[PDB]
């Protein structure tokens, strides 16, 4: 059966370069056209490149014209996308497709390869406490995990002994290239005078661990 497995990609810097790979198998590689489609996070699908089956005709939209170069190796059943002079906009998940030129549609899609392009480098988070506020009789407390890179961050509460009502929010991507997320817990408001709430933040990419105790005000 048709298989399109993509490799390459990763984390880059503005103005740098990358070459993506798509290995093809399960069909006769030289018959079909090939294309690259990307989807930036929180965005729709966007067509990037299309090459003939012979490397004969090659179409590019204007957003990436002259920056990307699509190629193919018949001997190795491989489709390539050379991305040069990368930008923060080009951060997306890149999909490799087999085309059927006769019908104007992509009948098979790859697994996808993620490309990140940012001017950040590894950084541990600054963890601050989110002192409680109401929800009365039910209160909400947490701790803010600010300005880290890259993902992921893991948070547990009271070393995992506290799980009831724990909700760790997905991180936002800041315009500074750094991540921020929050982990909040909801608890009976009565227990604030007696219970100790400590959030254990773990950021393995920078090997940083932070424990912050959340007190009332």
């Amino acid at each position: 059966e048709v298989q399109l497995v993509e490799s390459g990609g990763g984390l880059l810097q503005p103005g740098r370069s990358l070459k993506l790979s798509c290995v093809a198998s399960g069909f006769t590689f030289n018959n079909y056209w090939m294309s690259w489609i990307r989807q930036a996070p929180g965005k729709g699908l966007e067509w990037i490149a299309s090459i003939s089956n012979i490397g004969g005709t090659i179409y590019y939209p204007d957003s990436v014209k002259g920056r990307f170069t699509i190629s193919r190796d018949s001997a190795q059943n491989t489709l390539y996308l050379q991305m040069n002079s990368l930008r923060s906009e080009d951060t997306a998940t890149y999909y490799c497709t087999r085309d059927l030129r006769m019908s104007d549609y992509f009948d098979y899609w790859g697994q996808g390869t993620m490309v990140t392009v940012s001017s950040a480098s590894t950084k541990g988070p600054s963890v601050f406490p989110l002192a409680p506020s109401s929800k009365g009789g039910t209160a909400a407390l947490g701790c803010l995990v600010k300005d880290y890179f890259p993902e992921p961050v893991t948070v547990s509460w009271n070393s995992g002994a506290l799980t009831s009502g724990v909700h760790t929010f997905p991180a936002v991507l800041q315009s500074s290239g750094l991540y921020s997320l929050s982990s909040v817990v909801t608890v009976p408001s009565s227990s604030l005078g007696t219970q100790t709430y400590i959030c254990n933040v773990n950021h393995k990419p920078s090997n940083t661990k932070v424990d912050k105790k959340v007190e009332p005000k």
Binding site: Y105, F106, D107, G142, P170
Partner: protein, 213 residues
């Protein structure tokens, strides 16, 4: 050359029927072939409809493609909608070495009653203020369907800078949650009487306010 236009989000119920449209800006929708693709989060897209109204093997019979020249648009039709059909659908067409994709329509399969957002607003921590930084945290939870917009106000005036809001994310109980952050200088925070976070959900807004300690 042209632009394929789809609605942003449509929602239906189980077993019911929905029609997803893909109008074409200029020219005739019947000039070139139309293609439909289903997309799940963290998942590779699969082709659902090719050559205007052909479905590949394995695609369920519920899915069907059509063309309506009266509106110069195409339609993807889903009968007897399932929970698994909650996804994103993209129409596609080709013309003169260009592959035109639509904006996509996020199909919501309404499997529970509508829920109003729970909104909690945190001021900057005292510790953060001493580090010469200040962040407001607006946590939005327990709403369905999962699409909200957030607006921040300083005193009573709209804030046009420093706002970062997450895309809504599906919670454990199949409801959705999102979060919003406002970055300030400590002097900004202390200078205003209050800051407020407004969450609009199904055209009805919930609002919470905090003020410097």
């Amino acid at each position: 050359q042209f632009v394929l236009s789809q609605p942003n989000s449509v929602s239906t119920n189980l077993g019911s029927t929905v029609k997803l449209l893909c109008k074409r800006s200029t020219g005739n929708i019947g000039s070139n072939y139309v293609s439909w693709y289903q997309h799940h989060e963290g998942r590779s897209p699969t082709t659902m409809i090719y050559r205007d109204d052909q479905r590949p093997d394995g695609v369920p019979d519920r899915f069907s493609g059509s063309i309506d020249r009266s509106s110069n648009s195409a339609l993807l039709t889903i009968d007897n909608v399932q929970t698994e059909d909650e996804a994103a659908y993209f129409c596609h067409s080709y013309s003169t070495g260009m592959y035109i994709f639509g904006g996509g329509t996020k199909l919501t399969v309404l499997g529970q009653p509508k829920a109003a957002p729970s909104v909690t607003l945190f001021p900057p921590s005292s510790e953060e203020l001493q580090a010469n930084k200040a962040t407001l945290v607006c946590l939005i939870s327990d709403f369905y369907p999962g699409a909200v917009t957030v607006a921040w106000k300083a005193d009573s005036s709209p804030v046009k800078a420093g706002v970062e809001t997450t895309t809504p994310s599906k919670q454990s109980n199949n409801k959705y949650a999102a979060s919003s952050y406002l970055s300030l200088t400590p002097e900004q925070w202390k200078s205003h009487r209050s800051y407020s976070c407004q969450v609009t959900h199904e055209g009805s807004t919930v609002e919470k306010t905090v003020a410097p300690t």
